[PDB]
Amino acid sequence: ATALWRNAQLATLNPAMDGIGAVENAVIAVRNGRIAFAGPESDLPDDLSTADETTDCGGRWITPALIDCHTHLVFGGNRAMEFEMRLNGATYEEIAKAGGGIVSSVRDTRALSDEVLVAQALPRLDTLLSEGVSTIEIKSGYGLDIETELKMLRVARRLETLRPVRIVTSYLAAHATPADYKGRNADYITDVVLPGLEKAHAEGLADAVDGFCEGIAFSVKEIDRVFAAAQQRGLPVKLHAEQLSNLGGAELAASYNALSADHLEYLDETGAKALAKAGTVAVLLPGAFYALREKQLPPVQALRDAGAEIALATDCNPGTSPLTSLLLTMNMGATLFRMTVEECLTATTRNAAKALGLLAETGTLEAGKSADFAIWDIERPAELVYRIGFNPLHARIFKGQKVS
């Protein structure tokens, strides 16, 4: 099965090229869901000069399909109630008494069946897919008990069977301490987090292990205990770090050659250099920054100077970032974090694939990788970062197949 997509402008994001690796008057040759060639039509090899199908792209821009490397897409209910209460002047106490807080998401997720959870996640998933997203990372963390943490992962795996999308999962039991384990973080890790990890891995439901290293959650030493366990099983790790303060969560992840460190509002120069050295991707999440009215900006320039790679994600979750648009995420990255257009595009493609350890499989338009790309009805790549609340997607191709 072969197919050609010619007469196009390519944003290959090939790291061997400058900028976004733009190629004019180009073509993409596909064979069995894989890219056989991506470059000038004049350089198209002879054995690939023909195919079963040929699509005239009319000179439109083609980029790698987008990747959302950080989301909590699976969960029950929503947190609109406390949103409204907060705006009405309610205190944290009044909200808590009304049932607000992360406990609301935990309760709502524990109460639903896999079937219902899939039903509630599909609308969120489809919104991302409609914007050219082909790969999405989904975390657990709203169960805080083995039974529910695992259910969340099964739901994620299930979603992948209902839509043309690539889904990778992260075990995040080390998200918060349940009421029944208050003041006993160690016991929670011993009784819930670790045995949960072994079970998830045995079930093949977890692609990575995540954690929340913060003053209000788990300490560096506590997360270290979780990473050690994951490392022994061959599972890559990642971490929510320096979101609300500088604890050293970033340096910890870097010491474990973590796939990424996420949020990083309070990351320092030392931590940035550590991430770059370890090759750990810095995942910035503008949605949470925006929704939480945060004032401390992540150290973009320090990350740039250290040579660290920056990725951007929606951090889609009901409590701090009920965001379902990766296009908007890039606009926020530029507007709020002052990232350049080149950085924003690379952040949701090449670096996003890297943050998920899938760069060899997808993320760029290079021969040998999966044929996952998005055709855009734009005149300039910048349009994807410039517009606010618009979708110029023309077509989405997943594994060589035009899906929508």
Binder of Mg ion out of 187, 377, 380, 404 (CB under 5 A): 377
Check: CB of residue 178 under 8 Å from CB of residue 145.
yes
Q: Helix, strand, or coil here: 206? A: coil
Which phi and psi (to 5°) does residue 165 adopt?
Answer: -155, 155
The Cα 170–Cα 148 span in angstroms is 14
Which CB atom, from 120 or from 314, has the smaller least distance to Fe ion?
314
Q: Does 257 bind Mg ion (CB under 5 A)?
A: yes
Positions in 272-301 near a second copy (CB under 8 A)? 287, 290-291, 293
Contacts of 213 (CB under 8 A, 6+ apart): 219, 220, 222, 223, 239, 240, 241, 247, 248, 249, 252
The Cα 288–Cα 383 span in angstroms is 23
The Cα 105–Cα 316 span in angstroms is 13
* Sheet with 260-263: strands ordered across: 212-213, 238-241, 260-263, 281-284, 310-312
Check: CB of residue 356 under 8 Å from CB of residue 382.
no
Q: Does 56 bind a second copy (CB under 8 A)?
A: no
161 is in an annotated binding site: no
100 is in an annotated binding site: no
What are 138's strand-pairing partners? Answer: 169
Which amino acid, one-letter code, is at 236? P
257 is in an annotated binding site: no
Chain centre distance of CA 72: 9
32 touches, from a second copy, Mg ion, Fe ion, none (C-beta below 5 to 8 Å by class): none
What does the per-residue mask of binding to a second copy show for 316-335, with x meaning CB under 8 A?
-----xxxxx--x-----xx
Size of the site for Fe ion (CB under 5 A): 1
The closest of 239, 67, 64 to 168, measured between CA atoms, is 67
Positions in 319-378 near Fe ion (CB under 5 A)? none
Which amino acid, one-letter code, is at 240? H
Q: Does 34 bind a second copy (CB under 8 A)?
A: no
Q: Does 198 bind Mg ion (CB under 5 A)?
A: no
Contacts of 383 (CB under 8 A, 6+ apart): 376, 392
Q: Does 63 bind a second copy (CB under 8 A)?
A: no
Q: Does 315 bind Fe ion (CB under 5 A)?
A: yes
401 is in an annotated binding site: no
Check: CB of residue 288 under 8 Å from CB of residue 320.
yes
| CA distances from residue 301 to 70, 148, 260, 340, 361 in whole angstroms, order as listed | 22, 40, 18, 11, 29
Q: Does 25 bind a second copy (CB under 8 A)?
A: no
Which phi and psi (to 5°) does residue 27 adopt?
Answer: -155, 150
257 touches, from Fe ion, Mg ion, a second copy, none (C-beta below 5 to 8 Å by class): Mg ion
Which CB atom, from 57 or from 326, has the smaller least distance to Fe ion?
326
Q: Does 113 bind Mg ion (CB under 5 A)?
A: no
Which CB atom, from 119 or from 186, has the smaller least distance to Mg ion?
119
Binder of a second copy out of 385, 393, 395, 397 (CB under 8 A): 385
What does the per-residue mask of binding to a second copy show for 345-384, with x meaning CB under 8 A?
--------------------------------x-xx-xx-
315 touches, from Fe ion, a second copy, Mg ion, none (C-beta below 5 to 8 Å by class): Fe ion
Binding segment (CB under 8 A) for a second copy, from list 37-45, 74-82, 217-225, 358-366: 74-82
Q: Does 82 bind Fe ion (CB under 5 A)?
A: no
Q: Binding site membership for Zn(2+): which residues?
A: 70, 72, 240, 315
Q: Binding site membership: which residues?
A: 70, 72, 79, 142, 175, 240, 243, 315, 317, 319-320
> Where does this chain bind a second copy (CB under 8 A)?
78-81, 83-84, 87-88, 123-124, 127, 287, 290-291, 293, 314, 321-325, 328, 334-335, 338-341, 377, 379-380, 382-383, 385-392
Q: Binding site membership for 4-imidazolone-5-propanoate: which residues?
A: 79, 142, 175, 243, 320
> Where does this chain bind Mg ion (CB under 5 A)?
257, 278, 377
